[PDB]
Amino acid sequence: CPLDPYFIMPDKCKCVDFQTLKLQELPDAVPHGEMPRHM
Amino acid sequence: CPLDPYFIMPDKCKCVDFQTLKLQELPDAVPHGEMPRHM
Amino acid sequence: LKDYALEKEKVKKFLQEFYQDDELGKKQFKYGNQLVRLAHREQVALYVDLDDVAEDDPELVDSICENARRYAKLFADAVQELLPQYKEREVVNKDVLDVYIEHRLMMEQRSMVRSPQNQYPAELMRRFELYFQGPSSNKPRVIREVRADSVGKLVTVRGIVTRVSEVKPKMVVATYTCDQCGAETYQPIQSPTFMPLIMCPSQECQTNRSGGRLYLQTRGSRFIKFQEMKMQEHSDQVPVGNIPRSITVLVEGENTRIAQPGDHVSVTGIFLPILRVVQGLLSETYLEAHRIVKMNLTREELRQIAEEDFYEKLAASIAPEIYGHEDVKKALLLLLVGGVDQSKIRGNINICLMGDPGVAKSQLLSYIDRLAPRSQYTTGGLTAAVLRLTLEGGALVLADQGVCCIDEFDKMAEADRTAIHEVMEQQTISIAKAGILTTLNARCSILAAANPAYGRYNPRRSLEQNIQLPAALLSRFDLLWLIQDRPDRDNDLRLAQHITYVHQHSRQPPSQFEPLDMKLMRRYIAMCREKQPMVPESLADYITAAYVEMRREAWASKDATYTSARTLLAILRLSTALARLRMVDVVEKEDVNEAIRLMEMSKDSLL
Amino acid sequence: TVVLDDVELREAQRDYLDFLDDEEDQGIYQSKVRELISDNQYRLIVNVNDLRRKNEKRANRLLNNAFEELVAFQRALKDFVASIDATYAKQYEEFYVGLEGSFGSKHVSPRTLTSCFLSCVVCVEGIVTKCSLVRPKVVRSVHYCPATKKTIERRYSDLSVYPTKDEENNPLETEYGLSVYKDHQTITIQEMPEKAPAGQLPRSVDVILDDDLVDKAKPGDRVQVVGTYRCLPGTFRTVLIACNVKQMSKDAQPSFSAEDIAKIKKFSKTRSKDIFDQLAKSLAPSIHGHDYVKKAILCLLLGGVERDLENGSHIRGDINILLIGDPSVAKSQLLRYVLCTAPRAIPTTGRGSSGVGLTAAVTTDQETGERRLEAGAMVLADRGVVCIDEFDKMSDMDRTAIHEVMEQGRVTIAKAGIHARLNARCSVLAAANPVYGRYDQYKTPMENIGLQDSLLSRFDLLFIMLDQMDPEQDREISDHVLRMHRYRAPGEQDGDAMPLGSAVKMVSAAFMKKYIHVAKIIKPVLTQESATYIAEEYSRLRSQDSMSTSPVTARTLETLIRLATAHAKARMSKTVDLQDAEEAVELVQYAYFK
Amino acid sequence: TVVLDDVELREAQRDYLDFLDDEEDQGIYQSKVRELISDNQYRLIVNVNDLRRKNEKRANRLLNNAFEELVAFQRALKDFVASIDATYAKQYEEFYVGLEGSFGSKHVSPRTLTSCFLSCVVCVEGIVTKCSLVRPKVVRSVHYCPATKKTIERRYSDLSVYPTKDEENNPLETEYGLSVYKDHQTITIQEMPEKAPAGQLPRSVDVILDDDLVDKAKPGDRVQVVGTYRCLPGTFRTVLIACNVKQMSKDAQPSFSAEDIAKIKKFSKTRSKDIFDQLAKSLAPSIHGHDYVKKAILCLLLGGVERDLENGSHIRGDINILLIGDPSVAKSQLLRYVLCTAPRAIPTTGRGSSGVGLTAAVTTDQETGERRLEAGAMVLADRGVVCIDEFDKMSDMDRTAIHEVMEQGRVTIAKAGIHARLNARCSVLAAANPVYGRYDQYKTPMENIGLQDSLLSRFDLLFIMLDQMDPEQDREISDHVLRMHRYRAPGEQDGDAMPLGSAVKMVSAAFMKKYIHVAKIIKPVLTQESATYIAEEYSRLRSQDSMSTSPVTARTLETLIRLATAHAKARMSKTVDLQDAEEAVELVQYAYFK
Numbered sequence A, B: 001c002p003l004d005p006y007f008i009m010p011d012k013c014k015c016v017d018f019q020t021l022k023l024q025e026l027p028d029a030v031p032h033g034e035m036p037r038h039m
Numbered sequence C: 001l002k003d004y005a006l007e008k009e010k011v012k013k014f015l016q017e018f019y020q021d022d023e024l025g026k027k028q029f030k031y032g033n034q035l036v037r038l039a040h041r042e043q044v045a046l047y048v049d050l051d052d053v054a055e056d057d058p059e060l061v062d063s064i065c066e067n068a069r070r071y072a073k074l075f076a077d078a079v080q081e082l083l084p085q086y087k088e089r090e091v092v093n094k095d096v097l098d099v100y101i102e103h104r105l106m107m108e109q110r111s112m113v114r115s116p117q118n119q120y121p122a123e124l125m126r127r128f129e130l131y132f133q134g135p136s137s138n139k140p141r142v143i144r145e146v147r148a149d150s151v152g153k154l155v156t157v158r159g160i161v162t163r164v165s166e167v168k169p170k171m172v173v174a175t176y177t178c179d180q181c182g183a184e185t186y187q188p189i190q191s192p193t194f195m196p197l198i199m200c201p202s203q204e205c206q207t208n209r210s211g212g213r214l215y216l217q218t219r220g221s222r223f224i225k226f227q228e229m230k231m232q233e234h235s236d237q238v239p240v241g242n243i244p245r246s247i248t249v250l251v252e253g254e255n256t257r258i259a260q261p262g263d264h265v266s267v268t269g270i271f272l273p274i275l276r277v278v279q280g281l282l283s284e285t286y287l288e289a290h291r292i293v294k295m296n297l298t299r300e301e302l303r304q305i306a307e308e309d310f311y312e313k314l315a316a317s318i319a320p321e322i323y324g325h326e327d328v329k330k331a332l333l334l335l336l337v338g339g340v341d342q343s344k345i346r347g348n349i350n351i352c353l354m355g356d357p358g359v360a361k362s363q364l365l366s367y368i369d370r371l372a373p374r375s376q377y378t379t380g381g382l383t384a385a386v387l388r389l390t391l392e393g394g395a396l397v398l399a400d401q402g403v404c405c406i407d408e409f410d411k412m413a414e415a416d417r418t419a420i421h422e423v424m425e426q427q428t429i430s431i432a433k434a435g436i437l438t439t440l441n442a443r444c445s446i447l448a449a450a451n452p453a454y455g456r457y458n459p460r461r462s463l464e465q466n467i468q469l470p471a472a473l474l475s476r477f478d479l480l481w482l483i484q485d486r487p488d489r490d491n492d493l494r495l496a497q498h499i500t501y502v503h504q505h506s507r508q509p510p511s512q513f514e515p516l517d518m519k520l521m522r523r524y525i526a527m528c529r530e531k532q533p534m535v536p537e538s539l540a541d542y543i544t545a546a547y548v549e550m551r552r553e554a555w556a557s558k559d560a561t562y563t564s565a566r567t568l569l570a571i572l573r574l575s576t577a578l579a580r581l582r583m584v585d586v587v588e589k590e591d592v593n594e595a596i597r598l599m600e601m602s603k604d605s606l607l
Numbered sequence D, E: 001t002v003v004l005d006d007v008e009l010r011e012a013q014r015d016y017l018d019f020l021d022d023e024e025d026q027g028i029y030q031s032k033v034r035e036l037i038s039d040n041q042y043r044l045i046v047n048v049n050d051l052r053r054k055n056e057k058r059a060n061r062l063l064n065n066a067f068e069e070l071v072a073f074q075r076a077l078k079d080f081v082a083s084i085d086a087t088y089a090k091q092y093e094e095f096y097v098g099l100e101g102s103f104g105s106k107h108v109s110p111r112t113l114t115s116c117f118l119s120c121v122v123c124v125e126g127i128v129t130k131c132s133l134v135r136p137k138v139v140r141s142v143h144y145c146p147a148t149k150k151t152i153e154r155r156y157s158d159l160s161v162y163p164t165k166d167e168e169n170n171p172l173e174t175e176y177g178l179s180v181y182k183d184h185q186t187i188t189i190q191e192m193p194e195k196a197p198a199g200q201l202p203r204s205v206d207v208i209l210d211d212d213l214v215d216k217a218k219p220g221d222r223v224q225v226v227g228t229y230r231c232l233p234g235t236f237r238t239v240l241i242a243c244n245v246k247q248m249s250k251d252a253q254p255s256f257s258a259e260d261i262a263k264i265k266k267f268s269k270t271r272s273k274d275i276f277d278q279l280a281k282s283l284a285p286s287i288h289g290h291d292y293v294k295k296a297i298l299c300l301l302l303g304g305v306e307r308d309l310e311n312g313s314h315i316r317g318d319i320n321i322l323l324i325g326d327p328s329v330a331k332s333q334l335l336r337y338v339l340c341t342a343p344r345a346i347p348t349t350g351r352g353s354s355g356v357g358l359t360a361a362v363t364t365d366q367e368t369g370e371r372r373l374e375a376g377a378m379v380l381a382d383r384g385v386v387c388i389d390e391f392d393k394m395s396d397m398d399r400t401a402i403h404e405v406m407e408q409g410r411v412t413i414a415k416a417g418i419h420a421r422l423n424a425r426c427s428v429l430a431a432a433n434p435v436y437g438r439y440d441q442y443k444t445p446m447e448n449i450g451l452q453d454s455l456l457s458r459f460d461l462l463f464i465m466l467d468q469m470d471p472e473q474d475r476e477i478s479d480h481v482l483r484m485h486r487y488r489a490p491g492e493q494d495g496d497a498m499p500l501g502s503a504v505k506m507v508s509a510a511f512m513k514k515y516i517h518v519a520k521i522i523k524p525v526l527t528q529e530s531a532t533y534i535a536e537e538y539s540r541l542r543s544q545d546s547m548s549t550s551p552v553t554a555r556t557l558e559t560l561i562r563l564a565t566a567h568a569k570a571r572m573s574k575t576v577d578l579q580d581a582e583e584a585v586e587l588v589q590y591a592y593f594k
Ligand SMILES: Nc1ncnc2c1ncn2[C@@H]1O[C@H](COP(=O)(O)OP(=O)(O)OP(=O)(O)O)[C@@H](O)[C@H]1O
Pocket: C321, C322, C323, C324, C325, C356, C357, C358, C359, C360, C361, C362, C363, C450, C451, C495, D457, D554, D555
């Protein structure tokens, strides 16, 4: 302030859209005989 | 069940009278030139 | 908002002081006498009429209905309190439970304040079952109408039992014994499942801390009869656009074994939840059963009945949009009224239809199912089954003196063909999933519909040459009508004219007699079911005269026309069915002649 | 820590009560509550623009803060009902407010439903896909303590937790009668499949329904629901709480632009007779021949007009066409044309949609082990079009399920203790190669594939196209093919091909799509002349039935009626025409006679 | 988790209203509340035994269960007052219940108030020693939030803590008028000093007063309080919440036994003339001589009669004696005779009680740094006796305050802003040896001690006893001394002494104590004959005042009035006898004329 535990009150919780993607090295950019890296 | 903190409710907390005393060894029973012990 | 103790005294007053003049005007404490029976162990189930409480306290009745479970416990404990008063005899110790109860009472009496735990549950001081019966004021409620609003209340409903599980013993109060202190421990049970107790909470082992581990004892515990069933909405309840909805019902104690699948029963009981968490908990609902009962115009209407073309007008009203086939429409009407079943006689009129696809056949059945007061539709499940562990009745059972319309009849499984054979034979369905020939009373009329294989019918190919059914089974049908797509340019044009009018009007062309509302038709049918016309023996002479005549025609026919005593019996069914349409309790020569005419036309359809 | 007075809530409730106090004014809302009381329901409907007109500030307050303002509104409504009748108010623990009318920004789609709308009213328009079972949700549970002889209550609302023991561990017994329960159903909405890009992903939004709102929705319904979009307790999950639901008409209308209407009317009035033939030539110009098939495909798109009788009949206006022919024939190319061309279409394979298949299916959630009624591909095509490829490869369960929709247009399911009767009225264009290729004109059309002859009866039309090795015909097709190959855009230098982009006389597909949509609104009725003419034609076809495809039957008659009705739409005639029936008659004769 | 109905509390609340519904019955309680309405107070007084009569069970429940039962009773009271008058009820937030009547075992003393009575009503009896200042205590604080335009409450009741910010951290400004405050005071009771064994430790019990009960008590008041004994939050401190306080008269009554009364009556009726001297000889039998002093000391114990006049003049009935005399004379011995014999006496030294001293004082608690007005020895002896030794060594402030209490029997105090005025009417028996020993019989007693010439005027009597070295007198004393020393108890062998105890004609001291206790209640009044006779004697002393101890003055006249009043009490004669005035006159003559 019960110590650590707290209750979230979602009514005032402001949120935004959210999306995770994965990108890869282009096939030209990869070295010969190498695995493209992923981020 | 708040965690360790709890609220005591004195309305139902029955109690009894309470008293502490100190008792000393008798002057007869103490050894010569020694301090009587206390309990 | 109200002291249950105060309510407890009012019911005890009502029980001990309500009476009604019995047969010969005998002023009798109806419940009091039952209490005397109960104290003697002469009764177990104590059904309670709420209208008796309505006799002197309708306010109490509404309070009872507002929370039925609460007042049930109040009534039960009131009976538990008044039992020693009405006790006069010490009946023999019926079953171990009474003597075990007595031994428990003796030890309790051998004990002065006592903690709430160290006292027997009230539900163990039992072997009297208590129930209510819904008031006449509260009308029976459609299943779909019963929603979450009415939970926690007593209500009365009506429906059809789709299925019932076997009777099984449901525990009421688990009983245990301590390992060390040897004290008895009790545990009433509410949910369908529970966890057995382990450690004894008795005072001695509690103090001794001797690791007293409870072990259950079936003899100590108390069980009750208990079966599970799923009633279904009655056909009339469901609108045409909707479908029936099921309601699980938990029958227990004496109420068990009182119903079978297909029984058009009426149930009164409490609608309560069962928990077998978004914004609150979600929980399945059910209806705890209390009472079960297996159930069964204007002058101008009579003038219409007096019309000689009345049944003809009714026949025209059967699918009037279906141009033609009026003789068939009459035959469908005979099926809807059915026979009489005088004594017995098989009053069901099973009719089979065969013909090329696209001849209103499918549409005809749908109209019949709509018109039928109780009916089932299928294609070919049909028969009963033992689901895994419950008897689930097929649509044949759900007919139950209604009609089981069966489209696509030719493509039925041959096993089902054998099954319906039994139905037409004995009006029963025997099924053995586990080699147990469970038999169900499947009284009903079967309206079959099929088409010849390989396209349209071929007259050059004999009957059953174009159709893949046992010819014997065809003979079992009361009537068998054939429809052939004969290209008749005028009649086909007449049908085309009929279709175009319907497209341009969404109505059939104006007939001689307009079709009547299906409710009016059903009312006439219900009136016809009231009648059971008899067969005077004078008619038998003419009937037999006609029968031997047509039997001679069969011998004259190169192909056997299935004439037999079966044919005679069917003619008897049709004639008395016509007598029901006439509202006359004697079959007429006219009725006999017309039935022969339809029989001849059905045979002529085989041309 | 006890709240005493909320002046804002006090005034806001008064403002609603003044608004509901509709006696000095036209009485529209006073009459509505009076009608609501007679209806015996407990959910008034409200148009937002009335609130805007009477108080713009209050309406803006409502839309920006849906929750608290509605609570004040429901407070005012219950008080207002109690004013009109106390006992009727006492029947129900509460009342509810249904919103309606125009919403500028808050009227969105699941595609456009951004996270920003949280706590705001939103009018989401879309299509129902999944529906859960009706379940009774507990909201307020009353308990009784015989030891203390004391009654205790609890409310859950938005807030294991089911209390069963007193603080002194006395047993508690739940007063089931006094406890409050309400039916509660969950559904899912998605964007209308016609107006959604293929590149983007689904945007499924979960909806909560309670009380009367529970079963005012089914899978595969085009609806708009107004509600309060909210998060959920825990990155969070978000759901919409319905305040009012309505099933908009699935036909809708082709608003578009008046310029499109004028161009349509100008083109229609240019050559109304040739519009049918001209459209057919421009329907699938990449494929040469099969012109009668193109005419039928146009008839399928326009379709007929459903007729419903006093007996509850629903005589279908839809048309169902089956195409059979050897592989490496444009059948597949025809379906691509229809998908690009049709106003509301949806493709599917012989397998059908994954899991759900062609028609609906019951699927457990497997995230909470929860049953869900999932609409299938067929159901979503209701009052639209479905294109089925590899129709021969339909599964046997689907081979049976197709019968109901083909006959009644409605799929039913009672399985898994789950009862539903969904609408699937959809003109269907099916196609299937013959087995082993190499069609033989000696066996039945069924025997080359296997359809049981019930489906062939159900289909309005069947067309058979064969890989004839006629050098003249093959020259005509191949020369057409190479002409398409040689064809280059006017702006190009014969050099590079089109870029590999990430994105995906003859009239335009869009303008044609607009016109058929407009034509679909038209409701051509029958003419006594054409009715007499077609009846003679049918009886003539019955006379033709003496010669020894399926024989002519009443199915073929109604098929012709829809075909003439479809051609009546094609020329925008408010009634059918002898030209319409005549075109249908030759089309049917071509189908059954080569 | 929100309680709905309490059947027990409902019935209990109903039963109290039924009990308070005293209309068909004798109407006593209906009249009480009507008087309460007229008198504007808000604390009904109730005899518990009448509640037992109407409902023994409820009365048992009330005594055993205090906090809940009273709350129901207050509810019934508030509704009952609302029944008789709504607006008067609405004036007060709440109402209170006052208990009374016989409390069987719950009537205890602070010694006997064990922890067993916790949460049980208790009717304690004792003496108030420590008092705290009146303070207003908040109970219901009311706050306003201009940001939210919202008003909240927060009760405290039995329960950083003060709320000042909205949960949104908006400021909260309190609403003083709306909030509820109540005056609140703390005091401490102890067992009555006369009936309190020396072996046992003090057993002091706290008390909490609120509302009108705040100021209805002062230090040194003999009061009976009825309240609910409760623990406190934390080995837990325990306090008593007063439900009603009443000041029992310090006169009380001589309960004893009728046998004691009959023995006293027989003894009184035996010889009324010699009872004074017989008591006097048997008053201090160990002491030899000083017969006038013994006669004087008896009069002091008997006490005169206080006269309170129409103007508020309060001529004291108490008598004051000072003993001056050379050391090793039986002065300290004489007072211990008085301590053993006096019905209500308190010993003390020149320095007085620790901190508080002789008279009252203000004391910071130092456990909370809190002021406490603490009663001193003089106040505690009110309507009693105080025995001061080394009175010469009394401090100067005490030499100031002694003037007030001697003049008025009333110590006032305003220190630390603590206005108070404590009753201190107490006959005083001071003793002080001459300074440096060896009294000079030439100057004033003041010149030998230094009493500032005023306190000698205040003292009604002043007796000098010098060690005159007469061999005859010494023989008389030494004969007496050795006779007492040589004495052995009747059962003894002239062997062992008394054991080392671990616990602490001639009439018994206790018999004397009981007798004088009875005699104090008697209220003898003047006779015209004696009134005439004493006036002659006082004038005669004025005539004898010509020679030149202090002169006879009007102080001396009233001193004789009290002495004749005292001797009248000695014989239980309700009319003062000429013998009484006779013995007083000669006694005064000895005091001033050796
Ligand atoms: N005699 C008739 N009068 C009126 N309508 C008819 C007639 N025969 C057929 N029809 C029409 O035929 C249309 C389509 O055929 P229909 O549904 O009757 O086939 P069916 O005979 O049930 O076929 P099947 O058993 O092969 O499935 C129906 O809409 C029905 O209105």
